[PDB]
Protein backbone atom coordinates (compact mmCIF):
# COMPACT_ATOMS: atom_id res chain seq x y z
CA UNK A 1 0.00 0.00 0.00
CA UNK A 2 2.75 2.38 1.04
CA UNK A 3 5.12 2.96 -2.16
CA UNK A 4 9.29 3.30 -1.26
CA UNK A 5 11.00 4.99 -4.16
CA UNK A 6 15.19 5.31 -3.94
CA UNK A 7 17.09 7.63 -5.93
CA UNK A 8 19.76 6.83 -7.60
CA UNK A 9 18.95 3.52 -8.97
CA UNK A 10 22.64 3.13 -8.95
CA UNK A 11 25.99 4.86 -8.80
CA UNK A 12 29.51 4.81 -8.93
CA UNK A 13 31.84 6.29 -6.03
CA UNK A 14 35.46 6.35 -5.10
CA UNK A 15 36.91 5.76 -1.69
CA UNK A 16 37.03 8.49 0.35
CA UNK A 17 34.12 9.86 -0.85
CA UNK A 18 30.91 11.08 1.13
CA UNK A 19 27.84 8.85 -0.79
CA UNK A 20 23.89 10.09 0.24
CA UNK A 21 20.87 7.85 -1.05
CA UNK A 22 17.59 8.80 -0.99
CA UNK A 23 14.48 6.89 0.04
CA UNK A 24 10.78 8.59 -0.30
CA UNK A 25 7.57 7.06 0.83
CA UNK A 26 3.76 7.93 -0.58
CA UNK A 27 2.66 8.48 3.23
CA UNK A 28 4.31 10.10 6.54
CA UNK A 29 6.15 7.59 7.97
CA UNK A 30 6.99 9.36 11.38
CA UNK A 31 10.36 7.93 10.91
CA UNK A 32 9.50 4.17 11.37
CA UNK A 33 12.36 3.23 8.47
CA UNK A 34 15.64 1.74 8.58
CA UNK A 35 18.31 1.34 6.11
CA UNK A 36 20.01 -1.75 5.56
CA UNK A 37 22.86 -3.08 3.18
CA UNK A 38 23.07 -6.62 0.96
CA UNK A 39 26.00 -7.40 -0.54
CA UNK A 40 25.65 -9.65 -3.68
CA UNK A 41 24.67 -13.15 -2.42
CA UNK A 42 24.72 -12.02 1.73
CA UNK A 43 21.73 -11.75 4.15
CA UNK A 44 20.44 -8.11 4.45
CA UNK A 45 22.59 -5.96 7.14
CA UNK A 46 20.57 -3.59 9.23
CA UNK A 47 22.09 -0.25 9.06
CA UNK A 48 20.01 2.49 10.68
CA UNK A 49 16.66 2.45 12.28
CA UNK A 50 14.02 4.68 13.44
CA UNK A 51 15.43 7.27 10.63
CA UNK A 52 18.41 8.47 12.39
CA UNK A 53 19.66 6.01 14.54
CA UNK A 54 22.93 3.86 14.07
CA UNK A 55 22.37 -0.05 14.60
CA UNK A 56 24.95 -2.30 16.60
CA UNK A 57 27.47 -2.56 15.50
CA UNK A 58 27.81 -0.19 12.20
CA UNK A 59 30.42 2.24 11.66
CA UNK A 60 30.42 5.87 12.48
CA UNK A 61 30.52 7.06 9.01
CA UNK A 62 27.16 5.92 8.28
CA UNK A 63 24.42 8.18 9.34
CA UNK A 64 20.27 9.03 8.27
CA UNK A 65 18.30 11.52 8.50
CA UNK A 66 14.69 12.48 7.32
CA UNK A 67 11.31 13.24 8.64
CA UNK A 68 7.56 12.36 7.45
CA UNK A 69 8.21 11.45 3.81
CA UNK A 70 11.57 11.98 2.64
CA UNK A 71 14.69 10.83 3.96
CA UNK A 72 18.20 9.84 3.51
CA UNK A 73 21.41 7.98 4.02
CA UNK A 74 24.79 9.10 4.17
CA UNK A 75 28.11 7.56 4.40
CA UNK A 76 30.37 10.25 5.38
CA UNK A 77 33.50 8.51 3.97
CA UNK A 78 33.37 5.79 1.61
CA UNK A 79 34.78 2.27 2.29
CA UNK A 80 35.63 -0.85 0.47
CA UNK A 81 33.13 -2.83 2.62
CA UNK A 82 30.26 -0.26 1.84
CA UNK A 83 29.78 -1.81 -1.88
CA UNK A 84 26.22 -3.51 -2.30
CA UNK A 85 22.67 -2.51 -2.79
CA UNK A 86 21.09 -0.69 0.02
CA UNK A 87 17.48 -0.95 0.56
CA UNK A 88 15.03 1.47 2.69
CA UNK A 89 12.13 -0.17 4.78
CA UNK A 90 9.09 1.55 6.23
CA UNK A 91 7.50 -0.48 9.02
CA UNK A 92 4.87 2.07 10.13
CA UNK A 93 1.67 0.41 8.62
CA UNK A 94 1.39 -3.11 7.44
CA UNK A 95 2.32 -4.31 4.56
CA UNK A 96 5.65 -3.32 5.49
CA UNK A 97 7.50 -2.07 2.24
CA UNK A 98 10.99 -2.17 1.02
CA UNK A 99 12.67 0.37 -1.59
CA UNK A 100 13.81 -1.12 -4.80
CA UNK A 101 17.31 -0.41 -3.51
CA UNK A 102 20.33 1.78 -4.53
CA UNK A 103 23.08 -0.64 -6.10
CA UNK A 104 26.71 1.37 -4.88
CA UNK A 105 29.22 0.12 -7.21
CA UNK A 106 33.53 1.26 -6.23
CA UNK A 107 34.55 3.73 -9.34
CA UNK A 108 38.23 2.48 -10.34
CA UNK A 109 40.36 3.52 -13.85
CA UNK A 110 39.51 1.84 -16.72
CA UNK A 111 40.94 -2.11 -17.46
CA UNK A 112 41.63 -3.94 -20.08
CA UNK A 113 39.86 -7.49 -20.53
CA UNK A 114 42.21 -10.24 -21.34
CA UNK A 115 39.85 -12.67 -23.92
CA UNK A 116 39.91 -16.24 -24.18
CA UNK A 117 38.06 -18.67 -26.32
CA UNK A 118 36.78 -22.09 -25.59
CA UNK A 119 36.11 -24.91 -28.49
CA UNK A 120 33.15 -27.41 -27.64
CA UNK A 121 34.35 -30.55 -25.76
CA UNK A 122 34.55 -33.91 -27.38
CA UNK A 123 32.06 -34.90 -24.47
CA UNK A 124 29.33 -32.83 -25.70
CA UNK A 125 29.75 -33.06 -29.34
CA UNK A 126 28.59 -36.43 -29.45
CA UNK A 127 25.59 -35.29 -27.12
CA UNK A 128 24.67 -33.16 -30.72
CA UNK A 129 25.42 -29.48 -29.27
CA UNK A 130 28.32 -27.52 -29.46
CA UNK A 131 28.80 -24.35 -27.23
CA UNK A 132 31.39 -22.55 -27.99
CA UNK A 133 32.46 -19.90 -24.64
CA UNK A 134 34.32 -16.28 -24.99
CA UNK A 135 35.47 -15.35 -21.79
CA UNK A 136 36.58 -11.59 -20.75
CA UNK A 137 38.40 -11.44 -17.50
CA UNK A 138 39.11 -8.77 -15.46
CA UNK A 139 37.96 -5.26 -16.73
CA UNK A 140 36.21 -1.93 -16.09
CA UNK A 141 33.68 -0.62 -17.20
CA UNK A 142 30.76 -3.16 -16.90
CA UNK A 143 29.81 -2.04 -20.62
CA UNK A 144 31.65 -4.44 -23.32
CA UNK A 145 30.32 -5.44 -26.68
CA UNK A 146 30.72 -9.57 -27.52
CA UNK A 147 30.22 -10.35 -31.36
CA UNK A 148 30.19 -13.89 -32.37
CA UNK A 149 31.46 -14.20 -36.49
CA UNK A 150 31.13 -17.73 -37.64
CA UNK A 151 33.29 -17.70 -40.72
CA UNK A 152 33.28 -14.12 -40.83
CA UNK A 153 29.54 -13.94 -40.60
CA UNK A 154 28.66 -11.99 -37.54
CA UNK A 155 25.97 -14.01 -35.45
CA UNK A 156 22.32 -13.32 -34.03
CA UNK A 157 20.03 -14.48 -31.71
CA UNK A 158 21.74 -17.57 -30.07
CA UNK A 159 24.18 -16.33 -27.76
CA UNK A 160 24.09 -15.48 -24.06
CA UNK A 161 26.27 -13.71 -21.58
CA UNK A 162 26.30 -13.53 -18.10
CA UNK A 163 28.57 -10.91 -15.69
CA UNK A 164 30.25 -11.30 -12.32
CA UNK A 165 29.81 -8.72 -9.41
CA UNK A 166 32.35 -6.15 -9.05
CA UNK A 167 35.61 -8.18 -8.14
CA UNK A 168 36.32 -7.53 -4.37
CA UNK A 169 40.32 -6.89 -4.74
CA UNK A 170 40.47 -5.35 -7.97
CA UNK A 171 36.97 -4.38 -8.73
CA UNK A 172 36.79 -5.41 -12.52
CA UNK A 173 34.13 -7.11 -14.25
CA UNK A 174 34.45 -10.71 -15.88
CA UNK A 175 31.71 -11.93 -18.80
CA UNK A 176 31.26 -15.18 -20.02
CA UNK A 177 29.71 -15.48 -23.59
CA UNK A 178 28.46 -18.57 -24.84
CA UNK A 179 27.66 -19.66 -28.92
CA UNK A 180 25.21 -22.45 -29.22
CA UNK A 181 25.20 -24.35 -31.71
CA UNK A 182 23.77 -27.89 -33.53
CA UNK A 183 26.74 -30.29 -33.82
CA UNK A 184 25.25 -30.15 -37.74
CA UNK A 185 25.94 -26.53 -37.74
CA UNK A 186 29.17 -26.51 -36.23
CA UNK A 187 30.55 -28.92 -38.35
CA UNK A 188 29.42 -27.13 -41.49
CA UNK A 189 31.87 -24.28 -40.97
CA UNK A 190 35.16 -23.43 -39.70
CA UNK A 191 36.60 -20.13 -38.35
CA UNK A 192 35.03 -19.59 -35.07
CA UNK A 193 35.92 -15.77 -33.95
CA UNK A 194 34.69 -13.27 -30.67
CA UNK A 195 35.35 -10.21 -31.34
CA UNK A 196 35.79 -7.86 -28.31
CA UNK A 197 35.36 -4.36 -28.24
CA UNK A 198 35.96 -2.63 -24.74
CA UNK A 199 37.54 0.94 -23.39
CA UNK A 200 40.04 0.17 -22.13
CA UNK A 201 40.98 -1.38 -25.75
CA UNK A 202 42.36 0.71 -28.45
CA UNK A 203 41.42 -1.61 -30.88
CA UNK A 204 38.62 -4.22 -30.97
CA UNK A 205 40.49 -7.43 -29.90
CA UNK A 206 39.31 -10.72 -31.88
CA UNK A 207 39.97 -13.99 -30.30
CA UNK A 208 39.43 -17.22 -32.84
CA UNK A 209 39.81 -20.88 -33.89
CA UNK A 210 39.74 -23.19 -36.51
CA UNK A 211 37.81 -26.59 -36.15
CA UNK A 212 39.90 -28.38 -37.58
CA UNK B 1 26.12 -13.43 18.49
CA UNK B 2 22.75 -13.36 17.07
CA UNK B 3 22.29 -16.58 14.53
CA UNK B 4 18.91 -17.10 12.48
CA UNK B 5 19.30 -19.69 10.70
CA UNK B 6 16.92 -21.31 7.91
CA UNK B 7 15.88 -25.08 6.48
CA UNK B 8 13.36 -26.64 4.62
CA UNK B 9 13.88 -24.97 1.44
CA UNK B 10 13.71 -26.94 -2.51
CA UNK B 11 11.33 -27.92 -4.95
CA UNK B 12 7.71 -27.67 -5.13
CA UNK B 13 5.00 -28.31 -7.51
CA UNK B 14 2.23 -25.86 -8.00
CA UNK B 15 -0.26 -26.17 -5.31
CA UNK B 16 1.68 -28.42 -3.13
CA UNK B 17 2.79 -27.33 0.93
CA UNK B 18 5.95 -27.07 2.36
CA UNK B 19 7.17 -25.78 5.83
CA UNK B 20 10.20 -23.60 6.43
CA UNK B 21 12.44 -23.42 9.67
CA UNK B 22 14.26 -20.80 11.18
CA UNK B 23 16.61 -21.98 14.14
CA UNK B 24 17.01 -18.71 16.53
CA UNK B 25 19.99 -18.40 18.98
CA UNK B 26 22.03 -15.77 20.88
CA UNK B 27 19.08 -13.99 22.34
CA UNK B 28 15.50 -14.65 24.43
CA UNK B 29 13.69 -15.66 21.03
CA UNK B 30 10.72 -15.55 23.05
CA UNK B 31 10.70 -11.34 23.88
CA UNK B 32 11.57 -11.03 20.05
CA UNK B 33 8.57 -10.34 17.25
CA UNK B 34 9.78 -12.22 14.10
CA UNK B 35 9.35 -11.78 10.25
CA UNK B 36 9.56 -13.51 7.02
CA UNK B 37 10.70 -11.62 4.30
CA UNK B 38 11.39 -13.45 0.66
CA UNK B 39 13.36 -12.25 -1.81
CA UNK B 40 12.28 -12.64 -5.27
CA UNK B 41 14.04 -13.22 -8.81
CA UNK B 42 14.34 -9.72 -9.53
CA UNK B 43 15.76 -8.93 -6.25
CA UNK B 44 13.00 -6.85 -4.90
CA UNK B 45 12.20 -7.70 -1.24
CA UNK B 46 8.55 -8.75 -0.21
CA UNK B 47 7.33 -8.61 3.39
CA UNK B 48 5.56 -12.50 3.78
CA UNK B 49 4.18 -12.59 7.60
CA UNK B 50 4.98 -11.15 10.92
CA UNK B 51 4.17 -12.76 14.19
CA UNK B 52 4.16 -10.67 17.48
CA UNK B 53 6.01 -11.80 21.39
CA UNK B 54 2.18 -12.73 22.09
CA UNK B 55 1.94 -15.37 18.81
CA UNK B 56 -0.31 -13.01 17.21
CA UNK B 57 0.07 -13.16 13.22
CA UNK B 58 -0.07 -10.64 10.80
CA UNK B 59 -0.09 -11.11 6.69
CA UNK B 60 -0.08 -9.11 3.62
CA UNK B 61 -3.18 -10.28 0.89
CA UNK B 62 -1.10 -12.09 -1.21
CA UNK B 63 -0.63 -14.78 1.15
CA UNK B 64 -2.98 -14.46 3.35
CA UNK B 65 -5.16 -17.71 2.86
CA UNK B 66 -2.16 -20.28 2.29
CA UNK B 67 0.95 -19.21 4.30
CA UNK B 68 0.32 -19.75 8.44
CA UNK B 69 3.40 -18.25 10.84
CA UNK B 70 4.03 -19.92 13.93
CA UNK B 71 6.52 -20.13 16.48
CA UNK B 72 7.67 -23.03 19.52
CA UNK B 73 9.40 -20.62 22.25
CA UNK B 74 10.49 -23.27 23.56
CA UNK B 75 13.14 -24.93 21.18
CA UNK B 76 13.53 -21.57 19.42
CA UNK B 77 12.24 -22.46 15.96
CA UNK B 78 10.41 -19.61 13.85
CA UNK B 79 7.86 -21.46 10.98
CA UNK B 80 6.21 -20.29 7.58
CA UNK B 81 3.54 -23.61 6.82
CA UNK B 82 3.17 -22.03 2.84
CA UNK B 83 -0.14 -23.89 1.14
CA UNK B 84 -1.52 -23.61 -2.12
CA UNK B 85 1.88 -22.63 -3.52
CA UNK B 86 1.89 -20.78 -7.12
CA UNK B 87 4.67 -20.15 -9.11
CA UNK B 88 5.14 -16.62 -8.13
CA UNK B 89 6.15 -17.91 -4.77
CA UNK B 90 9.76 -18.72 -6.28
CA UNK B 91 12.17 -16.50 -4.48
CA UNK B 92 14.95 -16.87 -1.16
CA UNK B 93 13.21 -16.99 1.84
CA UNK B 94 14.73 -15.36 5.19
CA UNK B 95 13.07 -14.40 8.59
CA UNK B 96 14.15 -12.20 10.24
CA UNK B 97 14.52 -10.43 14.10
CA UNK B 98 12.62 -7.75 15.57
CA UNK B 99 13.54 -5.21 18.16
CA UNK B 100 14.28 -5.50 21.15
CA UNK B 101 11.25 -4.20 23.14
CA UNK B 102 9.03 -7.21 21.38
CA UNK B 103 6.43 -5.52 18.68
CA UNK B 104 6.26 -6.34 15.58
CA UNK B 105 6.14 -2.78 14.19
CA UNK B 106 9.69 -2.87 14.35
CA UNK B 107 13.09 -2.78 12.03
CA UNK B 108 14.50 -6.27 10.87
CA UNK B 109 17.34 -6.31 12.67
CA UNK B 110 19.14 -10.09 11.92
CA UNK B 111 18.92 -12.21 9.23
CA UNK B 112 18.76 -15.40 8.42
CA UNK B 113 21.24 -16.93 5.38
CA UNK B 114 17.86 -17.61 3.32
CA UNK B 115 16.59 -20.52 2.22
CA UNK B 116 15.18 -20.84 -1.32
CA UNK B 117 11.79 -22.11 -2.82
CA UNK B 118 11.24 -22.89 -6.19
CA UNK B 119 7.63 -23.74 -7.45
CA UNK B 120 7.21 -25.76 -10.98
CA UNK B 121 5.85 -28.69 -12.85
CA UNK B 122 9.05 -29.55 -13.81
CA UNK B 123 11.48 -32.44 -12.29
CA UNK B 124 14.96 -31.60 -10.81
CA UNK B 125 17.49 -32.30 -13.51
CA UNK B 126 20.79 -32.55 -12.71
CA UNK B 127 23.95 -30.51 -15.24
CA UNK B 128 26.17 -32.10 -17.74
CA UNK B 129 29.73 -30.96 -16.50
CA UNK B 130 31.78 -30.25 -20.32
CA UNK B 131 35.63 -29.09 -20.08
CA UNK B 132 36.77 -25.39 -21.46
CA UNK B 133 39.92 -26.57 -22.01
CA UNK B 134 43.07 -24.34 -22.24
CA UNK B 135 45.52 -24.40 -25.09
CA UNK B 136 50.84 -21.43 -24.97
CA UNK B 137 53.42 -18.07 -24.35
CA UNK B 138 55.80 -18.29 -21.59
CA UNK B 139 55.18 -15.48 -19.12
CA UNK B 140 51.81 -15.66 -20.01
CA UNK B 141 48.05 -16.60 -18.21
CA UNK B 142 45.92 -19.63 -19.45
CA UNK B 143 42.45 -19.70 -18.57
CA UNK B 144 40.28 -22.85 -18.11
CA UNK B 145 36.84 -23.49 -17.00
CA UNK B 146 33.99 -26.15 -16.63
CA UNK B 147 30.47 -25.42 -18.88
CA UNK B 148 28.03 -26.39 -15.96
CA UNK B 149 24.90 -27.27 -18.65
CA UNK B 150 21.61 -28.27 -18.54
CA UNK B 151 19.70 -28.59 -14.94
CA UNK B 152 16.82 -27.15 -13.34
CA UNK B 153 16.12 -25.81 -10.62
CA UNK B 154 18.69 -23.41 -9.22
CA UNK B 155 21.34 -23.31 -7.45
CA UNK B 156 24.67 -25.16 -8.87
CA UNK B 157 27.56 -24.54 -6.64
CA UNK B 158 30.81 -25.15 -7.84
CA UNK B 159 34.78 -25.07 -6.26
CA UNK B 160 37.91 -26.40 -8.23
CA UNK B 161 40.65 -28.97 -6.67
CA UNK B 162 38.12 -29.65 -3.43
CA UNK B 163 38.21 -26.23 -2.61
CA UNK B 164 42.41 -26.18 -2.60
CA UNK B 165 41.85 -23.57 -5.59
CA UNK B 166 40.27 -20.20 -5.08
CA UNK B 167 42.65 -17.46 -6.42
CA UNK B 168 41.55 -16.32 -9.95
CA UNK B 169 37.89 -18.75 -9.46
CA UNK B 170 35.13 -16.47 -11.38
CA UNK B 171 31.70 -18.92 -11.44
CA UNK B 172 29.49 -16.89 -13.52
CA UNK B 173 25.59 -16.05 -12.93
CA UNK B 174 23.18 -18.69 -14.23
CA UNK B 175 21.74 -17.90 -17.50
CA UNK B 176 18.33 -19.25 -18.37
CA UNK B 177 18.17 -20.83 -21.40
CA UNK B 178 15.82 -20.97 -24.39
CA UNK B 179 15.09 -24.82 -23.27
CA UNK B 180 14.06 -23.39 -20.12
CA UNK B 181 17.05 -24.97 -18.10
CA UNK B 182 19.94 -23.02 -16.93
CA UNK B 183 23.43 -23.36 -17.50
CA UNK B 184 26.66 -21.12 -16.01
CA UNK B 185 30.53 -21.37 -16.56
CA UNK B 186 33.08 -21.10 -13.95
CA UNK B 187 36.54 -19.91 -15.19
CA UNK B 188 39.90 -19.99 -13.34
CA UNK B 189 43.45 -18.36 -14.76
CA UNK B 190 46.19 -19.68 -14.15
CA UNK B 191 50.35 -19.63 -14.97
CA UNK B 192 50.97 -20.98 -18.31
CA UNK B 193 53.75 -22.96 -17.24
CA UNK B 194 51.83 -24.82 -14.79
CA UNK B 195 49.10 -26.17 -17.36
CA UNK B 196 51.20 -29.80 -17.90
CA UNK B 197 52.07 -30.73 -14.41
CA UNK B 198 49.17 -28.88 -12.16
CA UNK B 199 45.76 -30.73 -12.33
CA UNK B 200 42.36 -28.64 -12.76
CA UNK B 201 39.63 -30.31 -11.45
CA UNK B 202 35.91 -28.70 -10.91
CA UNK B 203 33.75 -30.17 -8.32
CA UNK B 204 30.04 -29.71 -9.32
CA UNK B 205 27.06 -29.94 -7.00
CA UNK B 206 23.88 -29.93 -7.64
CA UNK B 207 21.55 -30.94 -4.29
CA UNK B 208 18.16 -30.03 -6.14
CA UNK B 209 18.43 -33.27 -7.81
CA UNK B 210 22.06 -34.91 -5.48
CA UNK B 211 23.73 -34.61 -8.09
CA UNK B 212 27.86 -34.75 -7.09
CA UNK B 213 30.53 -34.47 -10.57
CA UNK B 214 34.23 -33.83 -10.58
CA UNK B 215 35.22 -33.26 -13.85
CA UNK B 216 39.61 -32.89 -14.44
CA UNK B 217 40.42 -30.19 -17.08
CA UNK B 218 42.59 -31.10 -19.19
CA UNK B 219 45.12 -28.93 -22.15
CA UNK B 220 44.39 -29.25 -25.66
CL1 LIG C 1 5.27 -24.39 -14.17
Known amino acids: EIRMTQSPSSMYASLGERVTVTCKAS??????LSWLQQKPGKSPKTLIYRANRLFDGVPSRFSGSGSGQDYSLTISSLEYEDMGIFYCLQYDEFPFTFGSGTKLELKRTVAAPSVFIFPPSDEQLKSGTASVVCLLNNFYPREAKVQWKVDNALQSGNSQESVTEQDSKDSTYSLSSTLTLSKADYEKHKVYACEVTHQGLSSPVTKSFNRG | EVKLVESGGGLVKPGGSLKLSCAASGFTFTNYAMSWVRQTPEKRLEWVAS???????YYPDSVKGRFTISRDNARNILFLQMSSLRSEDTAMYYC???????????????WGQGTSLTVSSASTKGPSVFPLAPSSTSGGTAALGCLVKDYFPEPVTVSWNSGALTSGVHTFPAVLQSSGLYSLSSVVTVPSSSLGTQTYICNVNHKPSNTKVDKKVEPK
Open chain 1, 27 to 32: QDINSY
Open chain 2, 96 to 110: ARGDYYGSVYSAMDY
Open chain 2, 51 to 57: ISSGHTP
